[PDB]
Amino acid sequence: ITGTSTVGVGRGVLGDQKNINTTYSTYYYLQDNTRGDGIFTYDAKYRTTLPGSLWADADNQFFASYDAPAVDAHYYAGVTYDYYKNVHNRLSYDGNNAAIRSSVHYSQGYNNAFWNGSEMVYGDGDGQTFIPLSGGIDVVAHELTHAVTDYTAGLIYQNESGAINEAISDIFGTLVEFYANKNPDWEIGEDVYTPGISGDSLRSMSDPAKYGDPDHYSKRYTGTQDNGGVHINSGIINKAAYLISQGGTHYGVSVVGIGRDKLGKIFYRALTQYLTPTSNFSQLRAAAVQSATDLYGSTSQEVASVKQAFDAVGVK
């Protein structure tokens, strides 16, 4: 929409008040003109037709419960855009400031969020397994990272390349969470998962096995469910990423952590420079070692830690 850029105020899914960038033209629209070609948030109105209607509001105040998921999807997409620009110097997901679109209130009681190759989509959850998925910053960053992956490595969504695709989204979703410093952790989806149970999360990077996911290649899922276990085998890569950053001893193998920043640097480089659509776990290890070498030298501790981390999770 063509209008005047302004700032509205609202309350997110978790009840927190935040300011959002909107556009004015008769109505106030969830259209942020301050980032690239814009950030647009749509109302799917509980249906499955996409993208739906560009979110319109009469007074620039978003405190209605219906508004909550829109506020967060819009706000978190901005934070995620900032992370990629400021930290990795990438302009939007395509690297050329492509408009970012998200639709909320997708379907009825839909327990998921996703990147469909064109935009992000968020369900409201059934109120038990999940509350509106855009309420979690690691969720929003996870979905937008899929867009980055689409325009770079293009990791096919199945088997090992799919598990890598998923892990990259969990890894960058977590780095964005730390970046915004929103009660950061190495857990995935803790803010929107199971509103009745506290202290749990959908997945864990620090300890994947906590929620039944493999933390070692010998324990990888080899079946056909979940596109060959993309949300299962990602635990192996998530564990490796956690080890590279924080360090620790896993299955007797010791890893000296090099921190989050270098983790982000190494993985972003591997993703955009070395990974291809069919890359498997072994190739990711080679990509990660190569990236750390490019950035820090072959005799660097950074290269050493990447090797130990993959050794620790059994990926040769």
Binding residues for Ca(2+): 57, 59, 61, 138, 177, 183, 185, 187, 190, 193-194, 197, 200
DSSP state for residue 26 in the 8-state scheme: S
x/- mask, ligand TI2, residues 81-120, rule CB under 6 A, reads ------------------------------xxxxx-----
Q: Which is nearer to ligand TI2, 138 or 311 (CB)?
A: 138
**How does strand 17-25 pair with strand 4-11?**
antiparallel
For residues 42 and 235, what is the distance between their CA atoms, to the nearest angstrom? Answer: 32
- Would you count residue 140 as binding ligand TI2 (CB under 6 A)? no
Q: How far is CA 76 from the centre of its chain?
A: 11
x/- mask, Zn ion, residues 157-196, rule CB under 5 A, reads ------------x---------------------------
For residues 210 and 198, what is the distance between their CA atoms, to the nearest angstrom? Answer: 15
- Using the rule CB under 6 A, give the single segment among 37-45, 56-64, 141-149, 214-222 that binds ligand TI2: 141-149
CB of residue 165 to Zn ion, shortest distance in Å = 7
Going from the C-alpha of 1 to that of each of 53, 54, 59, 238, the distances in angstroms are: 12, 9, 17, 40
CB of residue 174 to ligand TI2, shortest distance in Å = 9
Which residue(s) pair with 61 in the sheet? Answer: 9
Residues 142-201 that bind ligand TI2 (CB under 6 A): 142-143, 146, 173, 188-189
Residue type, 233: N
Structure tokens at 273: 């420079």
CB of residue 222 to ligand TI2, shortest distance in Å = 18
Strand ranges in the chain using DSSP code E only, listed in sequence order: 4-11, 17-25, 27-29, 31-32, 39-43, 53-54, 56-57, 61-62, 100-104, 113-115, 120-122, 187-188, 203-204, 248-250, 253-255
Residue 151 interacts, among ligand TI2, Zn ion, Ca ion, none and using kind-specific CB cut-offs from 5 to 8 Å, with none
Residue type, 313: V
Which one of 138, 143, 215, 302 is in contact with Ca ion (CB under 5 A)?
Answer: 138
> Which residue minimizes CB distance to Ca ion?
194
Annotated active-site positions, please?
A: 143, 231
Q: Which residues bind ligand TI2 (CB under 6 A)?
A: 111-115, 129, 136, 138-139, 142-143, 146, 173, 188-189, 202, 231
